[PDB]
């Protein structure tokens, strides 16, 4: 009713230790969400064209042109690691576990309160106003994860958070011929418009049932059940130079020290083994046959254009290309007492050794006369196309049928958790934004809107926008995310790398004297893992 | 609902007389608690450093340095005797009973009312606002008894009371080298900081489930069941000079009078008995062998330093050291019509005779030539260290395997009732702040907060503190504390000491003409008890 | 038989994760023990008297005088942590667990091989010689733990280890009157002899059944079952200055920074609370009443003499007194490729804050005029006895009925695991050499000897020692130690201290190029724990 609570606040993380070494991790997240009324109750079709910045030659990468439908609805996103885990729970997981499954997810909206403002300002209660809630369970509306705009719910259980205004990409066409500082004319830079066979205008009212929650009701999305592969919390270190049986050392060092080395006491042209260089007698570590390839090379800072503009070709693993950079604000880890609109940024350098170092590659003629001459080598310091700053490693692809990679690691707290699979005929082998990827059906999005509150002077035959009573809502969101983890076992004599608190990172986990908090990023895949 | 009461007011004390001489004492306590909204909805880490007062040489005991987390939550404490008993019930208990067990405890919060202020000032009702209640049943949060800051609920059933803002000690390091008035330099007085391996930041949102009570709901903590030892309401008088069989008097007085004495008509070196002075023939009362020792000596006004500063070494029983001093204000016994911030103070001088009188101790050489010379005695008037004001009794410890002590008596109305046991490997034999000590699990603390009431202009990406609607709550607290008592029996010909009203303490129990009340302190252990 | 193996080598540590958060840890330890024949097959009564070093005035602490029976038997000890755990398993335990129980223990001796030397040197097999094994299951022989002489089995599973020659203390009397550099005469330094009422001569042949194992048999001590208390892997940080409810801060800092502090805006003589200074109005942090006392003070570098000489009074917890110093050799953690007889040493500084800092104590007169004068204070810089280097804190004991302590932490890898309880009427509350203490019956010792191998010229009526054939044994020892552990839960927002590998301690866990190994010491009680 009017004065009866409809739910309970719970923000605990429970660790239930089943035997056989399996753990259930139940993460409860509760927030107080504050929602304003839409700026306009209409769907808008807006085009963003930043011609002022791309008309300058050499600024292709600063393209921001697109078209989007702006919606009067807001989205409630909880697809980030920091909504569910504090630094202590994350330490426990990444120090004691080895794998991680994603089991279940459920949401509820309770304790709705709607208020009106009258302008001093007076805040009254609208006991009869309504909050529209929609849940896209059939996944008709376009998927829009907020974690890559950093617009999820906040990371602190004691801070009220806001939802983000929902919008999606409308089709458009764009051609942008690249240039450099010092091209003569004006390269083609035009927004062509929209192709009628790709137009798609979605509305929440025509696609999903909308519930009207007043002050005493309660929305509960039933438990969604995932079916995915486990994310591994162990990293690999073995490149192709560290696979298989090492060479036999005929001379071992006798005075243990710092610069005393071993010696393979066999000439390189008189050794035994298999090579894939069928015209050479040398057997070294750079030439011996390994089972497969760990990693691949990819053209870095490469931009492919399509019907809607240029985009950076994504890279699977990093070494600074391949290493994702995160920028975020005060709800999501930045010091809550800073001033200014500059976001906090960090580059996540993963522990896994699957990237390449292009300053160490080279191609040489098949003849293989070993002290290699100039005309029989292509080095990373050779001009390609006549450009001093472009070498062959920029246009190089060594992805073949032999490469072995790893999925991307979790990024606490700003990374995504799950992601929908592409609805294409042939699917990609991995995403670069989430450790988990929902295969067939994965959780629906939760849109909220505050119902229109009309005055007494409303005529729909007026072209001007309607006059509404200034209304806002504050409701409570609760979520349950269930994981399955395996506890790790020690297989080495030596201890391993663990995450810990020390004199340097001490004050990143306790608040300041004025209530300032922050959530620094933690690494996920700490313990090594034998690859082969 | 909105206009239905959710509980009943009850402040009666029921005495149920079971046979076999056992009584059940059910104490009901009901209060109206008034709660304001937090000054800031953030956790703060504050350091208090009173260097201005300790930089003066000789002021070590005036140290107030520490670090604390300040919390937006408030604590509801009922761990004081005056919450449960009025002077009449206390008289009945301490005059008719001999022991006292602690059986059960339960709490409830009902009849919640939330209001908003609009500034003249107008007070409106927020029928949809919420009061957050948390109950730390698993005892995760640090134990903070309010009775030693005198911050429990009030002692009068007809006076509205407030809860105290919750806070707890954060780790820190501090070194303070002592000095005196007349030391040359500047002794080391530095706040070293915080040691990363002892940092502990607790939050209520991450540890306990929080219920959101609106105007028509009701929180009830189930009945907690104690398991402790009985507190004795009888005091002992026998020191070591009054244990066992007295000496036989060969001459008894024949003219009964005031200065007519008896005489042990045997020389002291020709008496029979056991001594522990194996090189002497004298048998006196100071030398004869007693079973054990009643009490012990302890270094008085001794300060031990540790990683966080200096503290007074606690003493078990008093004789003025060992006698606790209580300071308190108008909610807790002071005349409710006084003016000024000076608190009311009293020292509790217990009835039990287990302390020492250092002006009567002395050590003498093992030779025991009885009229003792100077060089064979150490008196309480001899300088130790060259200090005129320090004698050996200040650095003296006679706690051995033979000492027998008593637990501390209840202190009405400002004393604590129960206390948690230390979570250490080896536990102390007694606490000096409560007669009862919970052994394994004892009642959880009750935190309250008034939920954030946001305006329409809230953006979490502002460094400034959020703007909230001025809200306050008044709710009703009810508690039931169940004791088991034994009724006392008369074993002497003579009557005993009882607590009573007389012409001197008459107006301490009735109010003044302007409604002024007060609760004076009463003694608990009145009747004697045979020790041996 | 002669060519059939009688057992299996197993040195694995299994972690069986039962649910409810309980783990069984099964530690298997297998070694190859090499045993020589006794130097003499007789029991010897030897007296060690180092009068040459104690006759110099001031060298009392260098006393080594005693009497011992030297035995032809050897002891096989496995009561050290490094026999059972490598650094990785120890990391797992001390990073994921919170408690630790001791469940079971069992031993076996298998694959016995006996050989004779004939002098070049020829090594032949004695298929008919015997190895005597004795197991003191009833605990008749004196308990002799090897870990405090660092004479247990080795810490490496791939290194052959030796047993230690068994011996025990025979009664003697000794008086040593102390002196200093600059005493006139010759203080009494005499070995008085042996008191006939305390003589105790034990023999293995008269007390325990001895099995004669030839090349094809197998000794198995059945599983011994412990019954003890759990060792906690969590440390406490709260001293007496950090117990209970902090003081209310009336002024909180408004500009969060480094030197901005809070202020208790109440004068010290106008505050509320309880003190144990019943003659003072000041309420500070050094004076307010705490529940009990955490730790105690003890006279440091104090030597008590008894019928057999002077000994250091043991201290429970350290702050450098109280901190145990370990010295050990190449079998037990020192770099196996070092040269010289100098042992490797380390002092274990525990994490727990229960010790005292005597440079911060002081005693002052009961009058308590706060800016304290000279004659009303006793400082740690005041001469006691006229000695410039001795102050009152050296003769100070604050162990009373209120002190709370912790048991000692495990010391990897050189610490003991279990220890027998003293067979006295009143037992000590803790040992300082082992976390676990067997209460009633705990495992018997395992003595080995190689049977006498006589020549053809043996006559027992010759006073000279018999001529034996030079024989030695190598057998295999296997042991199973079963623990029960609890997995720890995160109760704080902040992460905690964990043990890890880093660039500094990297090469302590991998061998050198010449096979050099070492086992550095690791700390055990890492995570904090709320005491009150």
CSV table of C-alpha atoms in Angstrom, one decimal, chain A residues 193-414:
chain,number,residue,atom,x,y,z
A,193,UNK,CA,22.0,10.2,-45.8
A,194,UNK,CA,20.0,7.0,-45.1
A,195,UNK,CA,19.4,4.0,-47.2
A,196,UNK,CA,15.7,3.1,-47.2
A,197,UNK,CA,16.2,-0.7,-47.0
A,198,UNK,CA,18.1,-0.5,-43.7
A,199,UNK,CA,15.8,1.9,-41.7
A,200,UNK,CA,14.7,0.5,-38.3
A,201,UNK,CA,12.7,2.5,-35.9
A,202,UNK,CA,12.0,0.7,-32.6
A,203,UNK,CA,9.6,1.9,-29.9
A,204,UNK,CA,9.2,0.5,-26.4
A,205,UNK,CA,5.5,0.9,-26.4
A,206,UNK,CA,5.1,-1.4,-29.5
A,207,UNK,CA,7.6,-4.1,-28.5
A,208,UNK,CA,7.4,-4.7,-24.7
A,209,UNK,CA,4.6,-4.8,-22.1
A,210,UNK,CA,4.9,-1.8,-19.8
A,211,UNK,CA,4.0,-2.0,-16.1
A,212,UNK,CA,2.8,1.1,-14.3
A,213,UNK,CA,4.2,0.9,-10.7
A,214,UNK,CA,2.7,3.3,-8.2
A,215,UNK,CA,4.1,3.8,-4.7
A,216,UNK,CA,3.2,0.4,-3.3
A,217,UNK,CA,4.0,-2.2,-6.0
A,218,UNK,CA,7.1,-4.2,-6.9
A,219,UNK,CA,8.6,-5.4,-10.2
A,220,UNK,CA,10.5,-8.6,-10.3
A,221,UNK,CA,12.3,-10.0,-13.3
A,222,UNK,CA,12.5,-13.8,-12.8
A,223,UNK,CA,15.8,-15.5,-12.7
A,224,UNK,CA,17.6,-15.7,-16.0
A,225,UNK,CA,19.8,-18.8,-16.5
A,226,UNK,CA,23.0,-18.5,-18.4
A,227,UNK,CA,24.8,-21.2,-20.4
A,228,UNK,CA,28.4,-20.2,-21.2
A,229,UNK,CA,32.0,-21.3,-20.9
A,230,UNK,CA,34.2,-20.7,-17.8
A,231,UNK,CA,36.5,-17.7,-17.6
A,232,UNK,CA,39.9,-18.7,-16.4
A,233,UNK,CA,41.7,-16.7,-13.7
A,234,UNK,CA,45.1,-18.2,-14.6
A,235,UNK,CA,47.4,-16.6,-17.2
A,236,UNK,CA,49.8,-18.3,-19.5
A,237,UNK,CA,53.5,-17.3,-20.0
A,238,UNK,CA,54.7,-19.8,-22.7
A,239,UNK,CA,55.4,-18.3,-26.1
A,240,UNK,CA,56.6,-20.4,-29.0
A,241,UNK,CA,60.1,-20.4,-27.7
A,242,UNK,CA,59.2,-22.3,-24.5
A,243,UNK,CA,57.2,-25.2,-25.8
A,244,UNK,CA,58.4,-28.8,-25.6
A,245,UNK,CA,61.6,-30.4,-24.7
A,246,UNK,CA,64.6,-28.0,-24.3
A,247,UNK,CA,67.9,-28.8,-25.8
A,248,UNK,CA,70.3,-31.0,-24.0
A,249,UNK,CA,73.1,-29.0,-22.3
A,250,UNK,CA,76.4,-30.8,-22.6
A,251,UNK,CA,78.2,-28.3,-20.4
A,252,UNK,CA,76.6,-27.2,-17.3
A,253,UNK,CA,78.0,-24.4,-15.1
A,254,UNK,CA,80.3,-25.4,-12.2
A,255,UNK,CA,80.6,-22.1,-10.3
A,256,UNK,CA,77.1,-21.0,-9.5
A,257,UNK,CA,77.0,-17.2,-10.1
A,258,UNK,CA,75.4,-14.4,-12.1
A,259,UNK,CA,77.1,-14.6,-15.5
A,260,UNK,CA,77.9,-18.3,-15.6
A,261,UNK,CA,76.0,-20.0,-18.4
A,262,UNK,CA,75.4,-23.3,-19.9
A,263,UNK,CA,76.5,-24.5,-23.3
A,264,UNK,CA,74.8,-26.8,-25.8
A,265,UNK,CA,78.1,-28.4,-26.8
A,266,UNK,CA,77.0,-29.3,-30.4
A,267,UNK,CA,77.5,-27.1,-33.5
A,268,UNK,CA,74.3,-25.7,-34.8
A,269,UNK,CA,74.6,-27.5,-38.2
A,270,UNK,CA,75.2,-30.8,-36.5
A,271,UNK,CA,72.2,-31.0,-34.2
A,272,UNK,CA,69.2,-33.4,-34.2
A,273,UNK,CA,65.5,-32.4,-34.5
A,274,UNK,CA,62.8,-31.3,-36.9
A,275,UNK,CA,62.7,-28.0,-38.7
A,276,UNK,CA,60.2,-26.5,-41.2
A,277,UNK,CA,63.1,-25.0,-43.1
A,278,UNK,CA,63.6,-27.8,-45.5
A,279,UNK,CA,66.7,-26.3,-47.2
A,280,UNK,CA,68.8,-25.6,-44.1
A,281,UNK,CA,70.9,-27.7,-41.7
A,282,UNK,CA,70.8,-25.3,-38.8
A,283,UNK,CA,68.7,-26.3,-35.7
A,284,UNK,CA,68.3,-23.4,-33.3
A,285,UNK,CA,65.6,-22.2,-31.0
A,286,UNK,CA,64.3,-19.7,-33.6
A,287,UNK,CA,64.0,-22.5,-36.2
A,288,UNK,CA,63.0,-25.7,-34.4
A,289,UNK,CA,59.5,-27.0,-35.0
A,290,UNK,CA,56.9,-26.2,-32.4
A,291,UNK,CA,53.4,-27.7,-32.2
A,292,UNK,CA,51.5,-24.6,-33.1
A,293,UNK,CA,51.6,-20.8,-32.7
A,294,UNK,CA,50.8,-18.8,-29.6
A,295,UNK,CA,49.3,-15.5,-30.7
A,296,UNK,CA,49.3,-13.7,-34.0
A,297,UNK,CA,50.4,-10.5,-35.6
A,298,UNK,CA,47.8,-7.9,-36.7
A,299,UNK,CA,48.1,-4.6,-38.6
A,300,UNK,CA,48.2,-2.0,-35.8
A,301,UNK,CA,46.5,1.4,-35.9
A,302,UNK,CA,44.7,0.2,-39.1
A,303,UNK,CA,41.4,1.8,-40.1
A,304,UNK,CA,38.9,0.0,-42.2
A,305,UNK,CA,36.1,2.0,-43.8
A,306,UNK,CA,32.6,0.7,-44.5
A,307,UNK,CA,29.2,2.2,-45.5
A,308,UNK,CA,29.2,4.3,-42.3
A,309,UNK,CA,32.8,5.5,-41.9
A,310,UNK,CA,36.2,4.4,-40.7
A,311,UNK,CA,36.9,2.3,-37.6
A,312,UNK,CA,39.9,0.8,-35.9
A,313,UNK,CA,40.4,-2.9,-36.5
A,314,UNK,CA,40.2,-4.6,-33.1
A,315,UNK,CA,43.1,-6.6,-31.8
A,316,UNK,CA,42.7,-9.8,-29.7
A,317,UNK,CA,45.7,-9.6,-27.4
A,318,UNK,CA,48.0,-6.7,-26.6
A,319,UNK,CA,51.8,-6.6,-26.0
A,320,UNK,CA,50.6,0.1,-27.0
A,321,UNK,CA,48.0,-1.6,-29.2
A,322,UNK,CA,45.6,-4.3,-27.9
A,323,UNK,CA,45.6,-2.9,-24.3
A,324,UNK,CA,42.2,-1.3,-23.5
A,325,UNK,CA,42.2,2.2,-22.0
A,326,UNK,CA,39.4,3.0,-19.6
A,327,UNK,CA,38.2,6.5,-18.9
A,328,UNK,CA,35.6,7.0,-16.1
A,329,UNK,CA,34.1,9.5,-13.7
A,330,UNK,CA,33.1,9.9,-10.0
A,331,UNK,CA,30.4,7.2,-9.9
A,332,UNK,CA,32.8,4.6,-11.2
A,333,UNK,CA,36.1,4.8,-9.4
A,334,UNK,CA,37.4,8.3,-9.6
A,335,UNK,CA,38.1,10.2,-6.4
A,336,UNK,CA,34.6,11.3,-5.5
A,337,UNK,CA,36.0,14.6,-4.1
A,338,UNK,CA,37.9,15.7,-7.3
A,339,UNK,CA,36.8,18.7,-9.3
A,340,UNK,CA,36.6,19.1,-13.0
A,341,UNK,CA,35.3,17.2,-16.0
A,342,UNK,CA,38.6,15.4,-16.7
A,343,UNK,CA,38.0,11.7,-16.4
A,344,UNK,CA,40.3,9.2,-14.7
A,345,UNK,CA,42.1,6.9,-17.1
A,346,UNK,CA,44.1,3.7,-16.9
A,347,UNK,CA,45.5,1.2,-19.4
A,348,UNK,CA,45.1,-2.4,-18.5
A,349,UNK,CA,48.3,-4.3,-19.2
A,350,UNK,CA,47.4,-8.0,-18.9
A,351,UNK,CA,49.7,-10.6,-17.6
A,352,UNK,CA,49.3,-13.1,-20.5
A,353,UNK,CA,52.2,-13.4,-23.0
A,354,UNK,CA,50.4,-13.8,-26.3
A,355,UNK,CA,51.2,-10.5,-28.1
A,356,UNK,CA,54.0,-9.6,-30.4
A,357,UNK,CA,57.0,-7.2,-30.3
A,358,UNK,CA,57.2,-5.8,-33.8
A,359,UNK,CA,60.7,-4.3,-33.1
A,360,UNK,CA,61.9,-7.9,-33.1
A,361,UNK,CA,60.3,-9.4,-36.3
A,362,UNK,CA,61.9,-9.7,-39.7
A,363,UNK,CA,61.4,-11.5,-43.0
A,364,UNK,CA,64.3,-13.0,-45.0
A,365,UNK,CA,64.8,-14.7,-48.3
A,366,UNK,CA,64.1,-18.4,-48.6
A,367,UNK,CA,67.8,-19.1,-49.5
A,368,UNK,CA,68.8,-18.6,-45.8
A,369,UNK,CA,72.4,-17.6,-46.1
A,370,UNK,CA,72.6,-16.9,-42.4
A,371,UNK,CA,74.7,-13.8,-42.0
A,372,UNK,CA,71.9,-12.0,-43.9
A,373,UNK,CA,72.7,-9.3,-46.4
A,374,UNK,CA,70.6,-6.1,-46.9
A,375,UNK,CA,68.8,-7.1,-50.1
A,376,UNK,CA,67.7,-10.4,-48.5
A,377,UNK,CA,66.0,-9.0,-45.4
A,378,UNK,CA,63.0,-6.9,-44.5
A,379,UNK,CA,63.4,-5.3,-41.1
A,380,UNK,CA,61.0,-3.3,-38.9
A,381,UNK,CA,63.1,-0.2,-39.8
A,382,UNK,CA,62.5,-0.4,-43.6
A,383,UNK,CA,60.2,2.1,-45.4
A,384,UNK,CA,57.1,0.6,-46.9
A,385,UNK,CA,55.5,2.9,-49.5
A,386,UNK,CA,58.2,5.4,-49.1
A,387,UNK,CA,57.0,6.4,-45.6
A,388,UNK,CA,59.7,6.8,-43.0
A,389,UNK,CA,57.2,6.0,-40.2
A,390,UNK,CA,55.5,2.9,-41.7
A,391,UNK,CA,57.2,-0.5,-41.8
A,392,UNK,CA,56.0,-3.9,-42.9
A,393,UNK,CA,54.8,-4.9,-39.4
A,394,UNK,CA,52.0,-2.3,-39.9
A,395,UNK,CA,50.5,-4.2,-42.8
A,396,UNK,CA,51.2,-7.7,-41.4
A,397,UNK,CA,48.8,-10.5,-40.6
A,398,UNK,CA,50.0,-13.9,-39.3
A,399,UNK,CA,46.6,-15.3,-38.3
A,400,UNK,CA,46.5,-18.8,-39.7
A,401,UNK,CA,45.0,-22.2,-38.9
A,402,UNK,CA,47.7,-22.8,-36.2
A,403,UNK,CA,47.3,-19.8,-33.8
A,404,UNK,CA,46.2,-20.4,-30.2
A,405,UNK,CA,44.9,-17.5,-28.2
A,406,UNK,CA,43.3,-16.8,-24.9
A,407,UNK,CA,40.0,-15.1,-24.1
A,408,UNK,CA,40.2,-11.6,-22.6
A,409,UNK,CA,40.6,-11.3,-18.8
A,410,UNK,CA,38.0,-9.7,-16.5
A,411,UNK,CA,38.7,-6.0,-15.8
A,412,UNK,CA,37.8,-4.9,-12.3
A,413,UNK,CA,35.7,-2.8,-11.9
A,414,UNK,CA,35.0,-1.2,-15.2
